[PDB]
Design a protein around this nucleic acid. Structure first.
Length: 737
RNA sequence: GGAAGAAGAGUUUAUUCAGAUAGAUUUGUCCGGACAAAUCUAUCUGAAUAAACUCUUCUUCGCUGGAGCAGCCCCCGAUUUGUGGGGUGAUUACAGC
């Protein structure tokens, strides 16, 4: 349809389409892959062949150059004549044919019409408008593609074949609706954190909804375990760069047996952190060299809280200093003061003579503790599990035996005891008695008993009797105070220097010195003031018990579980608000919404409102200051909180209607001035207008070209009058619109 | 009616997503017309993360010496997890039979 003849001002609608394609490419380069993989990525089956899939995956970043080249040719009448023609040798021409064939086959699966072939062929090296619209189908949304499919293109003419042509070209296009990116890591963290935070604590579930006898996870779940540490470590890694915690892996007498090794490699996703009784290992790498420490939960929660206030990084610096200070103390142990005294462990201080304890007090402390443990075990006979009882009974036999039991023999005896086959135990005792490994007294005392409870009671009686016997050196041997020390001091000091740990409560004294408030008050004040502006979904019924006294009962536990849980809430926000880099810092959270405030008047009413799903990067979303500008210049009357859909449906239409009429006029002016005269603002430079006015007109043109507006108000009037000078005038009602 | 760890097989519970099917509202295109987007309300498939519950296979379950600056427990107080004072015959970033 005179595709080559179509030139000059008669064809300008492609210009804005390619300008939009450029800004879409700037937002995301992967849109090409997404459009090519629309039906396969989130679905079970792929109609693409393996070779076609390999071609699509390998073909990346080359197509955008071709798109940019075509945009330049369509943009200007002056230059770039040979861009349109392309060789059939190109692989892009192969993948286009494959995709078009698959799409037309899918449309033919609709068996309504097969009579007429849909035209999409490119004649030899040249490409028709069908090829151009098919190519620009990628990188754009549905509505712009429909507008370009309008009467501007000659294909729009309605026939019986028209509907199938509309479907085939639009097959690989993406709707301007959300199409939210959902497989990102941060979103999958946020959803699970919220879901787990919506669960009943165990202790409160035991009573409030507690049943006299006890569905399960069915209706109102119970959180069996707490996962505060896993989320806190993820947040700490995400926020800062230096910190990377240790991780554990498994790979492969007591020789060459597989033993877990703590390593700091981040290559494998399967690696899980190393937490054993609420201890972690941290790495601080900066400046001269790496360093490391181990920390408890108490110093972890304070740092996690400190980061959110915005002072976190400085705190990390203090950790870097800590080790050095300890070194100084090791030189001045005798000289230094009490504050440095609390830093060093016991054995270091004991050598200098400080903290020595009398032997008799040690004996008295040890013996009563051991006797209390053993008398508790006596009352706990039936309650304990078989695993504990078997070890308890075997301990007496192994202690009585003169020769240390072989590790291999231990397992079979443990299996025999746990199997309730006490006869095998008796047989083993008889076998060991003959060689005299074990005393015959144990065999005599064990023979009568027939149940594990009876044997446990017998053993407890013997242990209590032997503890009851008068003081002797055998008592010291049995309690373990008799052992001597044969290791030099220097090796122990070297080991201690190799392995250091942080004092408990170190962070709290440094900054919150004057504070009288506890943990909960400190969390709650920042939650109310800094802008959490939310509370956990659970009612205060579960987190407190009214009947029992406040201090009495299990209430001291739950009152803390709330105080930490609030912190978790804030962390979840950081995993969603950080999706966008440009905005997301000015964003303010409020009651399950996300609001972006625009000052405007001194009274703030120009705020815009997103939902959680809307903030997920739909194609409609953009940068920050452009929103304020489009609100200022267009639709001034509306005030108050505005749903983003209203701005989307109002401002963008006015912007497009203005821009099309502006660009067509400027192109016509360029053509006319080029004809009258007989790139890079050469015409505007030729104009007798002032250089400031040249800058104004080219700035106004390039602003509408780049889809962002930053020009001042006065420039548009100058552009209007200079355009009027050439004799072509049209009114767009831009100001006070 | 043994305990932890690993590999594997599943099972069902609650939130998200993609492609399709209807209803209302609303906007803009064409010579009253269909169409094109959107926001809510129901329908059908499929996919991913999390929690719990079964089954199969395997692996380890000892003794000696140093460490309690870290993790646990009792006194003493408290809108509560405290650089207030006393224990823990060791839980291990470890070394030897």
């Amino acid at each position: 349809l005179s595709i080559d003849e179509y030139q000059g001002a008669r064809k300008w609608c492609f210009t804005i389409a390619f300008n939009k394609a450029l800004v879409n490419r700037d937002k995301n380069d992967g849109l090409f892959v997404e459009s090519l993989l629309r039906h396969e990525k989130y679905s079970k089956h792929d109609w693409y062949d393996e070779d076609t899939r390999a071609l699509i995956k390998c073909s990346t970043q080359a197509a955008n150059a071709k798109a940019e080249a075509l945009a330049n040719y369509f943009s200007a009448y002056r230059h770039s004549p040979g861009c349109l023609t392309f060789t059939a040798e190109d692989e892009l021409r192969t993948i286009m044919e494959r995709a078009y064939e698959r799409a037309i086959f899918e449309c033919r699966r609709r068996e309504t019409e097969v009579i007429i072939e849909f035209p999409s062929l490119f004649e030899g090296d040249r490409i028709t408008t069908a090829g151009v619209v098919f190519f620009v189908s990628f990188f754009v949304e549905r509505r712009v593609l429909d507008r370009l499919y309008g009467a501007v293109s000659g294909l729009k003419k309605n026939e019986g074949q028209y509907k199938l042509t509309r479907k085939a070209l639009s097959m690989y296009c993406l709707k301007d609706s959300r199409f939210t990116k959902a497989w990102d890591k941060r979103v999958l963290l946020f959803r699970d954190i919220l879901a787990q935070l919506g669960r009943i604590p165990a202790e409160a579930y035991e009573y409030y909804h507690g049943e006299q006898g006890d569905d399960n996870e069915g209706t109102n779940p119970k959180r069996h375990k707490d996962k505060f540490i896993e989320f806190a470590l993820h947040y700490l890694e995400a926020q800062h760069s230096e910190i990377c915690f240790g991780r554990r892996h498994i790979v492969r007498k007591h020789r060459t047996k597989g033993k877990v090794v703590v390593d700091f490699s981040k290559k494998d996703e399967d690696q899980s952190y190393y937490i054993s009784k609420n201890n972690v290992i941290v790495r601080i790498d900066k400046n001269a060299g790496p360093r490391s420490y181990r920390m408890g939960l108490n110093e972890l929660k304070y740092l996690v809280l400190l980061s959110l206030q915005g002072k976190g990084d400085d705190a990390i610096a203090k950790l870097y200093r800590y080790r050095q200070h300890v070194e100084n103390i090791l030189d001045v142990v005798k000289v230094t003061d009490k504050d440095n005294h609390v830093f060093l462990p016991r054995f270091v201080l004991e050598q200098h003579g400080i903290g020595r304890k009398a032997f008799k007090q040690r004996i008295d402390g040890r013996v009563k503790h051991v006797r209390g443990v053993w008398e508790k075990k006596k009352a706990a006979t039936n309650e304990m599990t078989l695993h504990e009882k078997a070890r308890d009974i075997l301990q007496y036999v192994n202690e009585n035996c003169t020769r240390s039991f072989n590790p291999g023999e231990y397992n079979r005896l443990l299996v025999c005891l746990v199997g309730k086959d006490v006869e095998n135990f008796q047989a083993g005792l008889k076998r060991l008695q003959l060689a005299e490994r074990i005393d015959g007294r144990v065999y005599s005392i064990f023979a009568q008993t027939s149940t594990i409870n009876e044997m446990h009671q017998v053993v407890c009686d013997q242990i209590l009797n032997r503890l009851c016997r008068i003081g002797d050196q055998k008592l010291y041997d049995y309690v373990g105070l008799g052992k001597k020390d044969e290791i030099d001091y220097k090796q122990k000091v070297a080991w201690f220097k190799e392995h250091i740990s942080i004092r408990r409560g170190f962070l709290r004294k440094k900054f919150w010195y004057d504070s009288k408030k506890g943990f909960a008050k400190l969390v709650e004040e920042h939650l109310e003031s800094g802008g959490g502006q939310r509370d956990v979904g659970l009612d205060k019924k579960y987190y407190h018990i009214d009947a029992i006294g406040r201090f009495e009962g299990a209430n001291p536990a739950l009152y803390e579980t709330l105080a930490r849980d609030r912190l978790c809430l804030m962390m979840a926000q950081y995993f969603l608000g950080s999706v966008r880099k440009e905005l997301g810092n000015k964003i303010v959270w409020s009651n399950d919404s996300i609001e972006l405030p625009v000052e405007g008047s001194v009274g703030n009413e120009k705020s815009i409102v997103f939902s959680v799903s809307d903030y997920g990067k739909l194609y409609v979303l953009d940068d920050a200051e452009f929103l304020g500008r489009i609100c200022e210049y267009f639709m001034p009357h509306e005030k108050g909180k505005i749903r983003y859909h209203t701005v989307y449906e109002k401002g963008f239409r006015a912007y497009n209607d203005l821009q099309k009429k502006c660009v067509e006029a400027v192109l016509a002016f360029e053509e006319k001035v080029v004809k009258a005269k007989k790139d890079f603002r050469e015409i505007l430079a030729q104009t007798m207008c002032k250089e400031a006015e040249k800058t104004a007109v080219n700035k106004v043109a390039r602003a509408f070209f780049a889809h962002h507006l930053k020009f001042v108000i006065d420039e548009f009037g100058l552009f209007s009058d200079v355009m009027k000078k050439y004799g072509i005038e049209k009114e767009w009602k831009f100001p006070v619109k």
